Structure 1
Amino acid sequence: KGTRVFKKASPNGKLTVYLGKRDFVDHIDLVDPVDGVVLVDPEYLKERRVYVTLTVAFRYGREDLDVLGLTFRKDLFVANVQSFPPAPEDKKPLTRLQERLIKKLGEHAYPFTFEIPPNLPSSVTLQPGPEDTGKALGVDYEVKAFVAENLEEKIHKRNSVRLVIRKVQYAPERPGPQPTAETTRQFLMSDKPLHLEASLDKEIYYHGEPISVNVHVTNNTNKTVKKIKISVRQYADIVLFNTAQYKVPVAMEEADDTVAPSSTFSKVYTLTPFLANNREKRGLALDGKLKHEDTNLASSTLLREGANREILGIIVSYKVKVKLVVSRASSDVAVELPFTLMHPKPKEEDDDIVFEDFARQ
C-alpha cells in the first residue's frame, strides 16, 4: 500500500538497517515498537555476530559526538539484541513489515525489535545561553547495528551503522471544558476591582493547531484598559547536569482593544504557536534539530505523580498569558492558562516497497 522503508548502511557498505518509520509514537500506555531488519554481507560471517543496540541518552554537546571538551552523557535506557545468530528468540512477533522485508531482502535479512518502556523522555533538544549554536542539551534515541563477536569488543566505525530515531509524545483528548483562570485587582484609586477571566477551548493541542483564548473583563474601576497582549510561553526546566529554567514566547497577539471604565468586555482571541517564527531563539526546547523540517516545538512533558523528574532531563510545559495593559502611566493585569501540547495523531485509520534514505531530513 505504498510502503516506504527508510534504510541506511554502514560506512563499509556491509551492514544495512531498514525501518518503516523515523518517528515512533508514545501513546502513554505503550510506545509502538521499533521493528527493524538488518541485512548483512556473508562476507563478514567470519566475525560472525550481528548486534543491534538501542540507546536512550541525555547529552550535553554536539551531534557529531566529538567530546571536544565540556561534554556530558548519561544513559537513560539501553537495549541490546543479538540479531545474528537468531538467539533465544524471546518474542519475534514478526510485524507484517518485518516478514515482508525479510522475504523480499532474502536469506541474510535478520529482524530486530525493541520495546521502548513508557515514561521515558521524548526526543528533545535545546540550545542553552548564548547563541553560538555550539553545544546543545537534549535526549535522543540511537539505534546502532554492528558486527562484533561480543558486546565488549571495540567496534570499528566502518562496521557500525547509527540511526537517530525520534520518540514523539501523543495524547488523546477526552474533555469537559478547561477551567478558567482568574484575577481580581484593585487600581489606586479603585475601591472596586477590575476582574479578569480567561479560558481555553481544549486542554490538549497539537502542533499547528490554533489555540482559542476566551477573554472576559469586568472593569469596575475608573481606569481604562488600553491594550490586550495574548501570549504563548514555553517553559523549559533542565533537571540533569546543569539545573536551569528558560522561558520563551512562541506566539503573541497585541490587540488595541480597549475596556472602558465601568464596563464589561468579552472576546475570543486565536493564536498558534509556530516554530518557524522562533527559528532564531535559543533556550527553546524542540523535538529535534532545527535543521530538519520534521522538527517542531517540543511536546509537553507528561508527568505522572511521583515520577522521577530528574531522569526526564528537560521538563517542557506551555502556558497562555492574557495581559491587560491599564493606563495609570501604565499597569498590568494578567492570568496564565496551562495547556498540553502533543504530537499530532498519526494518520493510520508489484511489491509496494520504495526504499528511502534514512539519513536526516
Structure 2
Amino acid sequence: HVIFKKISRDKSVTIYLGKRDYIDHVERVEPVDGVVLVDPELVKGKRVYVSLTCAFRYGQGLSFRRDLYFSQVQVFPPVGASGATTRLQESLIKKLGANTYPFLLTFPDYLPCSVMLQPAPQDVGKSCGVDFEIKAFATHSTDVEEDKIPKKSSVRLLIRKVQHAPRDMGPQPRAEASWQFFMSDKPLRLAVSLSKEIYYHGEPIPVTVAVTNSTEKTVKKIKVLVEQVTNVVLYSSDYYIKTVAAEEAQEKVPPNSSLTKTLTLVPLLANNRERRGIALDGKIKHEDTNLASSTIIKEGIDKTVMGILVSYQIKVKLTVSGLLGELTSSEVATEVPFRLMHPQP
C-alpha cells in the first residue's frame, strides 16, 4: 500500500491511488478509492471524468476486446453526489489542496480476477487476458467539435483485481477410481483425498493416496501432479493443461498388495523456467506475478463472461507393469479438483 500517481502529458490531470491490487474475497470486492488533482487554469471550462474498465482481450494483426464492466464518474466540476470520503482520500485532499477531488469506483460481483496468458510455441491459441484500467481525462467542446478528448489531458493506471479466500470452504476433496485390465477381472483401486478444498499460493498440499492392488501387475510408479487447466471462453475456445508441480512416491506396489502414502506438492510459478502457456495474474517478466488464482464463478452467472476460466486439480498417475506377452507398461490416472488463491484478507 504505497501511494502512487500519474500526471497527464499536459499536466492538467493527475491521478492518485493508494494501491494497485484490489482484493476480491468473494463476499465483497474492495472498491477503487482515489483522488484527481487538477490544474485549475488548464481545466477551466472542461469536465474531468474517471472511469474503471474491466476488459477481456484476445490477440497477439488480429484482435478482439470485450468490456466486461465499465463505470465512469464526473469529478470536475463537482456533481455533489460523491458520498463519504475514505481515510486515504481525506488525507490526500488535506495534503494536496482544494483542486483535489475524490472518486470511488466500485466493482460488481460478476467479474473475473486478473488473469493473462501467452501461448507456448506448441500452443495454438493467441495471447489473451483480463485487464483492469483506471483512467482520468478532461473533455471539452469548441464551436466546431463537441466533447473532445485529447490524449495529452488523459492519464491511465493499470490495476489488479486479486482473488483472496472467502470465509467458507467446500467439502474435503475426495476421489475414488478402479480399473480392471484386459483379460483379468482383478481390480486396481485408487482412493485420493486432500486435506481441504482451498489452498493458498505457496501452501503445501498434502495428497493422501491409497492403492489397493488386487492385480497380477506391479504398480511401478506413483506420480502426483498439480495441473493448471485453462479454458478461454470468449472469442476462441482455447484449452491449456500444464503441470505446475510434481512428486513421485519413490515406492512400488507389488501384485496383491496395498499402500497408503501422503505426498506434499506446492504449485509455484517458480517451479519452472517456462512461463508461457500458463495462466498468470500479471506480466511474465514482472516480479510480483504469480500463477492465476482459481476462477470463482458466481451462482447463476453465464461462465463465458469470465473470459478465461482457470482451475486446478491433483492428478495421480499409476504406472503398471506389462504381463508376459504384453509389449509395454501402461498408465492409469484420476484427478481431484481443488481451488488455489490468496489467503483470507
TM-score w.r.t. structure 1 length? 0.87
Superposed displacement of residue 188, structure 1: 4.2
1:28 to 10, 26, 35: 26
Structure 1 vs Structure 2 CA RMSD: 2.1
Residue correspondence of structure 1 range 199-210 to structure 2 within 5 A: 199-210=193-204
Superposed displacement of residue 260, structure 1: 1.6
CA displacement 1:314-344 (0-9 Å, x = unmatched):
1111110011111113121211010011123
5+ long unaligned stretches in structure 1: 63-68, 347-361
3-state secondary structure, aligned to 1:158: helix
Residue correspondence of structure 1 range 178-197 to structure 2 within 5 A: 178-188=172-182, 190-197=184-191
Judge conservation of contact 1:28–1:119 (CA < 8 Å) in 2: no
1:224 to 198, 218, 223: 218
Judge conservation of contact 2:27–2:166 (CA < 8 Å) in 1: no
Residue correspondence of structure 1 range 326-337 to structure 2 within 5 A: 326-328=320-322, 329-337=328-336
Superposed displacement of residue 42, structure 1: 1.7
Structure 1 equivalent of residue 90 of structure 2 = 99
1:45 to 34, 38, 43: 43
The one-letter code matched in structure 2 to 1:58 is F
CA displacement 1:218-264 (0-9 Å, x = unmatched):
11112111111110111111111111211111111133310122111
Superposed displacement of residue 156, structure 1: 2.1
Judge conservation of contact 2:13–2:37 (CA < 8 Å) in 1: yes
CA displacement 1:120-166 (0-9 Å, x = unmatched):
1111111135379x96211111100111137x734222211111100
User: Which has the higher mean CA deviation after the structures are superposed, 325-334 or 188-197?
Assistant: 188-197
1:145–1:175 distance in 2 versus 1, CA, 3 Å: closer
Structure 2 equivalent of residue 338 of structure 1 = 337
The alignment-based identity, stated in percent, is: 60
d(CA) in 2 for partners of 1:305 and 1:95? 31
d(CA) in 2 for partners of 1:332 and 1:154? 64
Judge conservation of contact 2:172–2:197 (CA < 8 Å) in 1: yes
d(CA) in 1 for partners of 2:45 and 2:230? 46
The one-letter code matched in structure 2 to 1:291 is K
1:37–1:308 distance in 2 versus 1, CA, 3 Å: same
1:228–1:184 distance in 2 versus 1, CA, 3 Å: same
TM-score w.r.t. structure 2 length? 0.91
Structure 2 equivalent of residue 358 of structure 1 = none
d(CA) in 2 for partners of 1:274 and 1:174? 24
Structure 1 equivalent of residue 293 of structure 2 = 299
Residue correspondence of structure 1 range 4-19 to structure 2 within 5 A: 4-19=2-17
1:285 to 279, 298, 304: 279
d(CA) in 1 for partners of 2:66 and 2:150? 22
3-state secondary structure, aligned to 1:320: strand
1:164–1:213 distance in 2 versus 1, CA, 3 Å: same
3-state secondary structure, aligned to 1:4: coil
Superposed displacement of residue 175, structure 1: 4.8
3-state secondary structure, aligned to 1:310: helix
1:26–1:85 distance in 2 versus 1, CA, 3 Å: same
Superposed displacement of residue 109, structure 1: 0.9
Judge conservation of contact 2:173–2:195 (CA < 8 Å) in 1: no
d(CA) in 2 for partners of 1:51 and 1:137? 28
5+ long unaligned stretches in structure 2: 323-327
Judge conservation of contact 1:186–1:192 (CA < 8 Å) in 2: yes
The one-letter code matched in structure 2 to 1:128 is P
